Amino acid sequence: MEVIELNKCTSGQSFEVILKPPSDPSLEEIQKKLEAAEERRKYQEAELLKHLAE
Amino acid sequence: MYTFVVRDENSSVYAEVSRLLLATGQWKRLRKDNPRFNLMLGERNRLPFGRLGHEPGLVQLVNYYRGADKLCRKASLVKLIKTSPELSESCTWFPESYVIYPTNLTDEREVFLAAYNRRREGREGNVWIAKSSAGAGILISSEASELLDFIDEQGQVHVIQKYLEKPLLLEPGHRKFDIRSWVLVDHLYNIYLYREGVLRTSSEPYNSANFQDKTCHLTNHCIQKEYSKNYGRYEEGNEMFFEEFNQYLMDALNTTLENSILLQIKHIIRSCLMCIEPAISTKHLHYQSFQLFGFDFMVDEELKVWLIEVNGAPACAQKLYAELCQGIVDVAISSVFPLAPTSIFIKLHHHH
Amino acid sequence: MRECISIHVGQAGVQIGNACWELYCLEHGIQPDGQMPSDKTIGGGDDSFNTFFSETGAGKHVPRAVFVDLEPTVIDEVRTGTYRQLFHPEQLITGKEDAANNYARGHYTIGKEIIDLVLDRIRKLADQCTGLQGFLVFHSFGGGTGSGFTSLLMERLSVDYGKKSKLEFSIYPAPQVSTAVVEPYNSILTTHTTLEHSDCAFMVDNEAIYDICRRNLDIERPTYTNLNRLISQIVSSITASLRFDGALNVDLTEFQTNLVPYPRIHFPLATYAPVISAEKAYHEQLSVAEITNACFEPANQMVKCDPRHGKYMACCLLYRGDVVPKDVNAAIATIKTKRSIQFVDWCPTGFKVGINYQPPTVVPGGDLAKVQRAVCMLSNTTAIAEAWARLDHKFDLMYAKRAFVHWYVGEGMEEGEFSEAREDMAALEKDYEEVGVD
Amino acid sequence: MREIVHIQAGQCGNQIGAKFWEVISDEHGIDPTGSYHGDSDLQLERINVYYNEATGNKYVPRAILVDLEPGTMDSVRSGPFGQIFRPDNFVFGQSGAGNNWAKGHYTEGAELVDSVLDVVRKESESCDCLQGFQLTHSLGGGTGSGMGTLLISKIREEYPDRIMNTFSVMPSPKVSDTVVEPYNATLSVHQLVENTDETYCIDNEALYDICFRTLKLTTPTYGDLNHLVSATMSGVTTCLRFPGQLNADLRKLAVNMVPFPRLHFFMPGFAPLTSRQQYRALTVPELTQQMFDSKNMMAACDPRHGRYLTVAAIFRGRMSMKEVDEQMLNVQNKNSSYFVEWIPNNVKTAVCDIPPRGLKMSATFIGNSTAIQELFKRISEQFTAMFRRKAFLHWYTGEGMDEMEFTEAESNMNDLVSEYQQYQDATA
Numbered sequence A: 001m002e003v004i005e006l007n008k009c010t011s012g013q014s015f016e017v018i019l020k021p022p023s024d025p026s027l028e029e030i031q032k033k034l035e036a037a038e039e040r041r042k043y044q045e046a047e048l049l050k051h052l053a054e
Numbered sequence B: 001m002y003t004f005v006v007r008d009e010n011s012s013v014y015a016e017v018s019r020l021l022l023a024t025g026q027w028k029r030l031r032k033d034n035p036r037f038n039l040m041l042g043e044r045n046r047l048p049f050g051r052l053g054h055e056p057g058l059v060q061l062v063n064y065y066r067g068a069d070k071l072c073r074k075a076s077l078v079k080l081i082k083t084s085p086e087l088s089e090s091c092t093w094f095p096e097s098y099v100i101y102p103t104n105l106t107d108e109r110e111v112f113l114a115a116y117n118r119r120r121e122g123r124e125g126n127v128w129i130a131k132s133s134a135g136a137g138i139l140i141s142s143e144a145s146e147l148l149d150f151i152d153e154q155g156q157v158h159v160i161q162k163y164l165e166k167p168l169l170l171e172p173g174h175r176k177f178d179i180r181s182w183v184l185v186d187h188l189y190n191i192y193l194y195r196e197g198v199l200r201t202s203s204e205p206y207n208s209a210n211f212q213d214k215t216c217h218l219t220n221h222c223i224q225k226e227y228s229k230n231y232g233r234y235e236e237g238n239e240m241f242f243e244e245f246n247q248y249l250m251d252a253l254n255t256t257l258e259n260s261i262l263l264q265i266k267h268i269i270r271s272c273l274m275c276i277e278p279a280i281s282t283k284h285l286h287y288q289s290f291q292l293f294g295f296d297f298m299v300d301e302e303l304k305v306w307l308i309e310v311n312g313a314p315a316c317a318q319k320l321y322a323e324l325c326q327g328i329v330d331v332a333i334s335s336v337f338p339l340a341p342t343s344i345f346i347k348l349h350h351h352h
Numbered sequence C: 001m002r003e004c005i006s007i008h009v010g011q012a013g014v015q016i017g018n019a020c021w022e023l024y025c026l027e028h029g030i031q032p033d034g035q036m037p038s039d040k041t042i043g044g045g046d047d048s049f050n051t052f053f054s055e056t057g058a059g060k061h062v063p064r065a066v067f068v069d070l071e072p073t074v075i076d077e078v079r080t081g082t083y084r085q086l087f088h089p090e091q092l093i094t095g096k097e098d099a100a101n102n103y104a105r106g107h108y109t110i111g112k113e114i115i116d117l118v119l120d121r122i123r124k125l126a127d128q129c130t131g132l133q134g135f136l137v138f139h140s141f142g143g144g145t146g147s148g149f150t151s152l153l154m155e156r157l158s159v160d161y162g163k164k165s166k167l168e169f170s171i172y173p174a175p176q177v178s179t180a181v182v183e184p185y186n187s188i189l190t191t192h193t194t195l196e197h198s199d200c201a202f203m204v205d206n207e208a209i210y211d212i213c214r215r216n217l218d219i220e221r222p223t224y225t226n227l228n229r230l231i232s233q234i235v236s237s238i239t240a241s242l243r244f245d246g247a248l249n250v251d252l253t254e255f256q257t258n259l260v261p262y263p264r265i266h267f268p269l270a271t272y273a274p275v276i277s278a279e280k281a282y283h284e285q286l287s288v289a290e291i292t293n294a295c296f297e298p299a300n301q302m303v304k305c306d307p308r309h310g311k312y313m314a315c316c317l318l319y320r321g322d323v324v325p326k327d328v329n330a331a332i333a334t335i336k337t338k339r340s341i342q343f344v345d346w347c348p349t350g351f352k353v354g355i356n357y358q359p360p361t362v363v364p365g366g367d368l369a370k371v372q373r374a375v376c377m378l379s380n381t382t383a384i385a386e387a388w389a390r391l392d393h394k395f396d397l398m399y400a401k402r403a404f405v406h407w408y409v410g411e412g413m414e415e416g417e418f419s420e421a422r423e424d425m426a427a428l429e430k431d432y433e434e435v436g437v438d
Numbered sequence D: 001m002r003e004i005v006h007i008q009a010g011q012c013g014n015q016i017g018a019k020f021w022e023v024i025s026d027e028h029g030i031d032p033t034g035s036y037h038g039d040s041d042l043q044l045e046r047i048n049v050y051y052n053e054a055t056g057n058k059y060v061p062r063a064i065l066v067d068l069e070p071g072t073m074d075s076v077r078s079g080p081f082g083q084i085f086r087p088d089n090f091v092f093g094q095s096g097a098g099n100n101w102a103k104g105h106y107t108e109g110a111e112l113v114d115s116v117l118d119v120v121r122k123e124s125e126s127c128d129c130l131q132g133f134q135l136t137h138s139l140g141g142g143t144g145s146g147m148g149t150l151l152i153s154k155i156r157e158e159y160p161d162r163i164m165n166t167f168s169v170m171p172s173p174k175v176s177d178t179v180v181e182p183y184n185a186t187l188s189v190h191q192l193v194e195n196t197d198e199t200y201c202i203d204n205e206a207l208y209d210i211c212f213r214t215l216k217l218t219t220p221t222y223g224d225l226n227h228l229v230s231a232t233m234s235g236v237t238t239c240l241r242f243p244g245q246l247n248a249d250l251r252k253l254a255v256n257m258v259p260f261p262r263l264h265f266f267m268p269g270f271a272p273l274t275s276r277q278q279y280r281a282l283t284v285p286e287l288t289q290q291m292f293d294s295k296n297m298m299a300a301c302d303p304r305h306g307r308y309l310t311v312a313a314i315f316r317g318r319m320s321m322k323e324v325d326e327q328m329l330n331v332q333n334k335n336s337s338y339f340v341e342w343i344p345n346n347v348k349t350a351v352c353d354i355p356p357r358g359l360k361m362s363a364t365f366i367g368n369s370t371a372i373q374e375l376f377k378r379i380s381e382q383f384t385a386m387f388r389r390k391a392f393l394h395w396y397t398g399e400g401m402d403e404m405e406f407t408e409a410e411s412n413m414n415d416l417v418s419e420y421q422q423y424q425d426a427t428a
């Protein structure tokens, strides 16, 4: 039950008690995801419009 | 109208409780995967406790205490008794036991050999028994070499404990036996002891000069009904109940089952369950737990009671299923979900 | 002095963000118009509160915050609310139609079209910082914006601010205050793509805040207002070290050091006490031992789980009020002998303690009672994995039938991303089991 | 400013649409001349969802009235709130549709559709952020059924990413005008299954049986049947028309009610439904019991014959919201077999402080239940009974239609039935 690194200031204090010792995607890659999904939405809508045009 | 689910089809006890619940016309059984339930008769292994108590508008209750395995595992119980100050290492009612890991894998190998050598040098009875939870595989021997080589041949954890060389023998027969007590702990953590126990007797005369024939040393109902040749001679099914066992203790020993044995049993049950209460109690939890336990005891020739093991998913004596199961519904289920005596239990009061 | 920028995404983040800055102002003595009499350095300064507030030449203290929602009705309450004077208009960003509780819609469809605008506004705040620490991102798991647009923002923040730390405050979905059937989908999708970008995330289960509000505050049917005022109390306890003089958790880097030894297991459990009802006749003030013992009662945890059956990797005790180190250690010693506190072997069995003498501030007319001392315990337990298990289970139920999946695929997401995100959660659950189970 | 554009087509469509605008206009404080005379700000909070604001603080419904004969819309323009509609939004012909789907969809309807679309486009171009469209129509006639589904097809082509909602009256031989109603309904269901995001199925027999057996109206009329639809339409749009802790967005509603794209056909319900003992207060338990009772539902489908995929309940009035949650959870937990277990928490509940006219409180029910398949089974049976002999087919082949088109429509509706039955037997 040891207290270490005790700090005291006007607005409080802090310390540490030790009871026992121990034993990314680039900017380009993000644009490709976003544009890939956008292209899939445009393709799905184009199929809908091709269906409605038929 | 209360609802419950069943997730252990192999449970004889709760199959009856499930049969009684539906018999009250006020409980409805759901599919095992339906989450809107009041009661769960859960599986024995990997019961998903984390998914309980998260359905709005439902008080949920389960028939298992998360953490009771610490008491119902062979190796876990040994570690719990040696490490829990409430029980201490000098506990008088538990045989000197050691946890031994097979060499193909802390481990108390050297600590066991120290006490073994001590007994061998002191002319004392030095017979031990090796067993594991993965057994139906038990070995009784008086040589430390054999016990250790038997564990290395396996691949799971084992435990070696002192074999009671002076067990109490019933007459006629000169035969060993063990006592089984059923204990029900409800959500409030009241410890109830079923007034009815069973003695699983060995239909073979005890022989301390031949631990090879494990039929007169292991009182299991399976070994006695498979490898024993006097099964069903003295008592039906090698099962003697308290009434007969008590009258025997009076005619032969001039004592009663309450004084000579039962006080010690009640003491052991209290000590074991009160010890783990902080670790498994569902008092301030989002769900509630209850559980039935099977305590197995040994008695020696000094009328001293020893704790053998604690079973978390025990079966019941065929002749006692009705009374006990109904007892589970009365104090365990209906106490939380009331329906629209002279209790069969013995409340072991304590300090919560 | 180093600055922290707060980002509030979606309805949950915005309303919670609003409740936090209301509390910060009362804590630092900042009026709604932005003026601060106690600040003697007019139009500047490098004080502890300046990590969250910039200053104008006219003495206005302006939050270092950005509010983003894909629909304008929630942020309009900020534009016309009590603290409408704190934020300048550029700080409040709104679209015209939301993500419809659809992760793919907030991440791909709508996120692609507003991401570069959000970054530009964040860049404007960053350019006011002489030493930016990082970001605090508030959002919900279930919302389409909170889940979908946040994960996109987190990706871009790691690109534009590589050396900056990022803490989350995430609202875990609870059926008692949720009308979205697909929130388990959104929660897992956003956790998957955000995991490698968050250095420390504080999950708040709405189910827990709901029950605390009903059990302790006698609120029959709590609202978002009741929930947010309590959530902002906890948030204030957690961020106080950055806004006040002290030596514990003084920068965002310290949150990771003191709470996350394993990078993937960065979800500390928060426990707060005491929560006393203001309508009460008058409460008996709890001692350091009683409030500290309460930190080990599941009923005061931000996520309902059982730490008795996990293993601790770290533990921070953050006290606010009349507390001295002597009483803390005396209460802890009493608790170690009475509680089940199992630490992992590769970590020390210790407690870092922070005490700020200023007792918790309570919003006048709110529900919380003024207490003399309170504590917020931050512990990294494997037991919080129960929350992931619950969430994963609901995910599996719907995904086995592909229920609702067409809505996501219809916004340009591939079905494979569902199982890719699910397999990540399965790994996350394996790591917890390898750390806290024998 | 999430605007909805309303369209009502045919006789049934315009008579029910008329009463709908009558009911909600009263709720929002709009009088017959479009002037607001309410007393609460909540009435104008979301008024722009269904109304446009003109000069002089007037409010004009965003509604387009369509028919191939003048008669019905003449009545509307001369009705109670007839003056409230934009005169330019009346688009009608003179030939009629002869209760003939082919005439509304291909011949007579085709001649008039472009002028209707010009009115739709004009209403949209003044929308700050158009949510989507809602159409009221019958499926048993020619204009509402045939031209209505043609309008939906063309609306979807021009606004492919907007939500399309309909209130659809399904025919019943017990409440019938002509024998060809099964033909018209089956052809329309084929369109709806493909093009609408949400369809409230209103069965004229359920409306009849409620008026007769519950309301105790000896000889129900179409006007009596429409009182129920008006009230039901006011309930399901309460989320959209008033503020509250609910978002209520057409797209958000669809995401939470439609687990599979083809299974977007709902059973609506309303409570109370009291006969004239009409002044008694109704408790939250009573509201919840009735709202879930089959007799209070309007698809003529017993929910006990299927399972709920999703459910949305809206409570209106000043009531114990705690008591509401309790009663809703009680109904689920006490009948959990009727809710699919592979969609957790599939029952959502909303509340609104403003009750309908003359009611302390009420509850509207929206159920996406696999039991709706029995409705399509009825239509499919009546259809095949005639089609197997090609009876009455000449009215349709005379308009350029081929038998093959009938066969395809039938197969799609039967497929739809097969889907409901497969999710009704599904398990975790």
Ligand SMILES: Nc1nc2c(ncn2[C@@H]2O[C@H](COP(=O)(O)OP(=O)(O)OP(=O)(O)O)[C@@H](O)[C@H]2O)c(=O)[nH]1
Pocket (backbone or CB within 6 Å): C009, C010, C011, C012, C013, C015, C016, C069, C070, C098, C099, C100, C101, C102, C106, C140, C141, C142, C143, C144, C145, C146, C147, C171, C172, C173, C174, C177, C178, C179, C180, C183, C206, C224, C227, C228, C231
């Ligand atoms: N605690 C708390 N939770 C909230 C609040 N607002 C919303 N939530 C939760 O957030 C989840 C819904 O996500 P939202 O944040 O509302 O959705 P969103 O982020 O705005 O994204 P959209 O779908 O586009 O609206 C639900 O689980 C709500 O319970 C709030 O003010 N406080």
Ligand SMILES: Nc1ncnc2c1ncn2[C@@H]1O[C@H](COP(=O)(O)OP(=O)(O)CP(=O)(O)O)[C@@H](O)[C@H]1O
Pocket (backbone or CB within 6 Å): B095, B129, B131, B135, B136, B161, B162, B163, B164, B176, B177, B178, B217, B218, B219, B220, B296, B298, B308, B309, B311
């Ligand atoms: N230390 C010991 N001394 C004497 N007998 C012992 C003993 N350990 C075990 N036994 C004998 O073994 C039997 C119990 O075996 P144990 O309970 O360890 O195996 P098990 O758990 O697979 C059977 P069950 O769970 O049904 O009781 C008792 O009848 C007892 O006679």
Ligand SMILES: Nc1nc2c(ncn2[C@@H]2O[C@H](COP(=O)(O)OP(=O)(O)O)[C@@H](O)[C@H]2O)c(=O)[nH]1
Pocket (backbone or CB within 6 Å): D009, D010, D011, D012, D013, D015, D016, D097, D098, D099, D100, D138, D139, D140, D141, D142, D143, D144, D145, D169, D170, D171, D172, D175, D176, D177, D181, D204, D207, D222, D223, D225, D226, D229
């Ligand atoms: N509920 C209701 N149903 C109607 C009404 N008028 C007609 N119907 C039903 O609608 C079908 C006839 O369609 P109708 O609207 O008259 O044809 P249309 O004018 O060509 O669109 C039949 O099934 C009628 O039972 C009405 O006012 N109310």
Ligand SMILES: COc1ccc(NC(=O)CN)cc1
Pocket (backbone or CB within 6 Å): D173, D174, D175, D176, D177, D220, D221, D222, D225
């Ligand atoms: C309410 O309007 C009605 C219209 C038709 C009927 N009857 C038939 O359809 C012929 N059985 C009854 C009522």
Ligand SMILES: [Ca+2]
Pocket (backbone or CB within 6 Å): C039, C040, C041, C042, C043, C044, C045, C046, C047, C055
């Ligand atoms: Ca200053």
Ligand SMILES: [Ca+2]
Pocket (backbone or CB within 6 Å): C158, C162, C196, C197
């Ligand atoms: Ca990073």
Ligand SMILES: [Ca+2]
Pocket (backbone or CB within 6 Å): D108, D111
């Ligand atoms: Ca013509």
Ligand SMILES: [Mg+2]
Pocket (backbone or CB within 6 Å): B309, B311
């Ligand atoms: Mg055993």
Ligand SMILES: [Mg+2]
Pocket (backbone or CB within 6 Å): C010, C011, C069, C071, C098, C143, C145
């Ligand atoms: Mg939103």
Ligand SMILES: [Mg+2]
Pocket (backbone or CB within 6 Å): D011, D141, D177
């Ligand atoms: Mg007609």
